[PDB]
Amino acid sequence: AIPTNFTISVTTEILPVSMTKTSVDCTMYICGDSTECSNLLLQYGSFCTQ
Amino acid sequence: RVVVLSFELLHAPATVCGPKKSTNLVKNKCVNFNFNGLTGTGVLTESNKK
Secondary structure: OOOOOOOOOOOOOOOOOOOOOOOOOHHHHHOOOOHHHHHHOHHHHHHHHO | OOOOOOOOOOOOOOOOOOOOOOOOOOOOOOEOOOEOOEOOOEOOOOOOOO
């Protein structure tokens, strides 16, 4: 079976390229605005540096 | 002679209060507030809530 005609088909495909960049502040997330809590968070500072 | 005082805190309107002297309200500044015993810090402002 040999074709005797043709069609020019345009297909659309979508690909995600990136996602929303995000940043997090340990101090104001965990220890919202209290100094007493933020002092206790210093010993865990390494974790946030991760 | 035994007296058992029972109360709850920082959940409903309060009529019994400690012997702390109040202070004139200061808005729009990082102040440490104390409203009916609920301490903390932040910035006060006005709004409309029912």
